[PDB]
Amino acid sequence: TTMCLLANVTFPCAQPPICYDRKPAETLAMLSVNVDNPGYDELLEAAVKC
Amino acid sequence: YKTGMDSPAIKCCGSQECTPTYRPDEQCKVFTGVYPFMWGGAYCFCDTENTQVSKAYVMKSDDCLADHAEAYKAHTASVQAFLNITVGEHSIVTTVYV
């Protein structure tokens, strides 16, 4: 399993707290810090859709 | 290969520095005396003492997976035959190792 990061909150990468159709730049900042991640594609395709 | 290039760091009436990243063949150089233009006019107001940093590195191409060449070393081969033996009208077909 793989846990992603926005703060010290290790949320599951398939279940993000935010989506781009709600927030313009907070999703991009969440993707900013999590580039070095093997589950980045999971966080990616989950972080688009609600 | 695929020469990747970072965007030029521009400071107006300043001076940049070279911060390396240890990327493969990562060249970096700081250029002084630069008056750059954007589409919406000039970028600085200073004539001289401006600074642009070029940074380039080599990464491998996007089609590396399906289009690549494997360099090997070979030694001490192994011979292996598909015989079809019949001894007294009793036939087998067996991969024998020789």
Partner: protein, 314 residues
């Protein structure tokens, strides 16, 4: 499931970059060209441009950046050509797929009302045949070798490019004169910042306000930048960058080089004359054809020859 594919270039915007050959001279173009890749076999290239495809400002569209305001046209207005005209197949994100002939340049152009846009780049485009018969246009009939062409769908595979913060795109349609001073009018829903040199060292970030400044007489001394915290760009060398770690994510690239099947021609059958320990070969190639011979002994004495004329080999 195409909407799952397109959803990552929704985070991005088209931009303008410097093209060296425009309709008249050297300009800043909305259709600038970053790279041309031509390593698939039967004439398919993959352009990475400074525009975006498959998104609206919609099915067959180019989305570009016209001095900040994002515009759009249908895809059948855009044409490109190397030596002969190329044929645009599809687009996805910053990437375009065309069926091109061989040539030493790429030129993409579209036509607006009375403004013609163009961008010529000195990027070599080659044509790669399959097999031992060197054609220039793919045939009508033959046999089928395996090949490697750029795939036509936008399927997510394991190859990425790197996206970043757009930097401070400076503007000068913002800054204007008052009757006695300098006036900066940032656009609505967008924050500008102003650097001047008319007092000592002056700097400000302003929001949504026609904000004048005293002690500045001429508007040559003030540069009004523009800011967009959202809306990624590509890591281009034709753009300036932001301040501090710069990185915001990575996107997949469409149309990668996949294994396929390609039709190759079949040369006219050689006319073989036999003799005592000797074989004569009459050869009439339609287009240039490799003849490769070897002997089945401890010294092969292999012969390798491109033959493009009617020839007799003994």
């Amino acid at each position: 499931s195409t909407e799952e594919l397109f959803n990552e270039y929704k985070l991005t915007r088209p931009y303008m970059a410097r093209c060296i050959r425009c309709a008249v001279g050297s300009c800043h173009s909305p259709i600038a060209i970053e790279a041309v890749k031509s390593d698939g076999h039967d004439g398919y290239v993959r352009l990475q441009t400074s525009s975006q495809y498959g998104l609206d400002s919609k099915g067959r569209t180019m989305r570009y950046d016209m001095h900040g305001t994002i515009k759009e046209i249908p895809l059948h207005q855009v044409s490109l050509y190397t030596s002969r005209p190329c044929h645009i197949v599809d687009g996805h994100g910053y990437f375009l797929l065309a069926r091109c002939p061989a040539g030493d340049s790429i030129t993409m152009e579209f036509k607006k009302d009375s403004v013609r846009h163009s961008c010529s780049v000195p990027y070599e485009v080659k044509f790669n045949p399959v097999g031992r018969e060197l054609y220039t246009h793919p045939p009508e009939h033959g046999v089928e070798q395996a090949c490697q062409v750029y795939a036509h769908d936008a399927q997510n595979r394991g190859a990425y490019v790197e996206m970043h913060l757009p930097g401070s795109e400076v503007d000068s349609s913002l800054v204007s004169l008052s009757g006695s001073s300098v006036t900066v009018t940032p656009p609505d829903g967008t924050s500008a910042l102003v650097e001047c040199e008319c007092g000592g060292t002056k700097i400000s970030e302003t929001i949504n306000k026609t904000k004048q400044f005293s002690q500045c007489t001429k508007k040559e001394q003030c540069r009004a930048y523009r800011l967009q915290n959202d809306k990624w760009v590509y890591n281009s060398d034709k753009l300036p960058k932001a301040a501090g770690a710069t990185l915001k994510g990575k996107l997949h690239v469409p149309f990668l080089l996949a294994d396929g099947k390609c039709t190759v021609p079949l040369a006219p059958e050689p006319m073989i004359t036999f003799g005592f320990r000797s074989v004569s070969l009459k050869l009439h190639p339609k287009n240039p054809t490799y003849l490769i011979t070897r002997q089945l002994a401890d010294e092969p004495h292999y012969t390798h020859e491109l033959i493009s004329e009617p020839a007799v080999r003994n």
